């Protein structure tokens, strides 16, 4: 996240970090005790059996007793299209169930087909790049964004920070977009570099996949 602020510790208990060594590469959202939702492109050319799913984290550079670490057992994809970047969503089944507590909780999803119009105020968040100065963030960042149609496709939810250069960046993919307390987006792609000040950020529209998610989840 570029131009955002540190989140209050454990303010978003559904926030997940996907790691390869002990290196964060994508975010995710806890949707059930044993399932996380992320962007398909995050797991496309990665060694899935090597991915660690980190729950209850705040500061990645610190030892945090609040953490819960899981492995990936199965992957559920919908119609991921890497050329067009459509259906950039994946469900990952954990090798166990999280211990729900103050620091780890399940996110609330929107109803199927609910669409956001121009002007809805939402919060983006992630541990991605801070700009081109600053690599990945250590502490979770959050950012107020506005939904915009316009320089956006009907197949995405796009956002823009008006009047300043701010936005999601590499490493933010898979992280939630929260609007009116529900998960409405999954960070998918940028255009013109991160925080162009032109080109809205693009998210996978979770409302369009609710029926599918449920079918797997419950």
């Amino acid at each position: 996240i570029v131009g955002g602020r540190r989140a209050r510790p454990h303010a978003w208990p559904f926030m997940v970090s996907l790691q390869l060594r002990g290196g964060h590469f994508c975010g995710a959202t806890l949707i059930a005790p044993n399932f996380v939702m992320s962007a398909a492109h995050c797991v496309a050319n990665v060694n899935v059996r090597a991915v660690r799913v980190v729950l209850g984290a705040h500061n990645l550079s610190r030892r945090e007793p609040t953490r819960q670490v899981f492995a990936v057992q199965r992957i559920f994809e919908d119609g991921y299209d890497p050329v067009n970047l459509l259906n950039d969503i994946v469900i990952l089944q954990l090798n166990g169930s999280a211990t729900i507590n103050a620091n780890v909780q399940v996110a609330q999803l929107p109803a199927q087909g609910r669409r956001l119009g121009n002007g809805v105020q939402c919060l983006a968040m992630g541990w991605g790049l801070l700009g081109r100065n600053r690599g990945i963030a250590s502490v979770l960042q959050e950012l107020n964004v506005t939904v915009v149609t316009s320089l956006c496709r009907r197949s995405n939810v796009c956002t823009l920070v008006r009047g300043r250069q701010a936005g999601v960046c590499f490493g933010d993919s898979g992280s939630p977009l929260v609007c009116n307390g529900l998960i409405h987006g999954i960070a998918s792609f940028v255009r013109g570099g991160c925080a162009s000040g032109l080109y809205p950020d693009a998210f996978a529209p979770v409302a369009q996949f609710v029926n599918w998610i449920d079918s797997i989840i419950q």
Partner: peptide
Amino acid sequence: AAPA
């Protein structure tokens, strides 16, 4: 577009 660059996937993030």
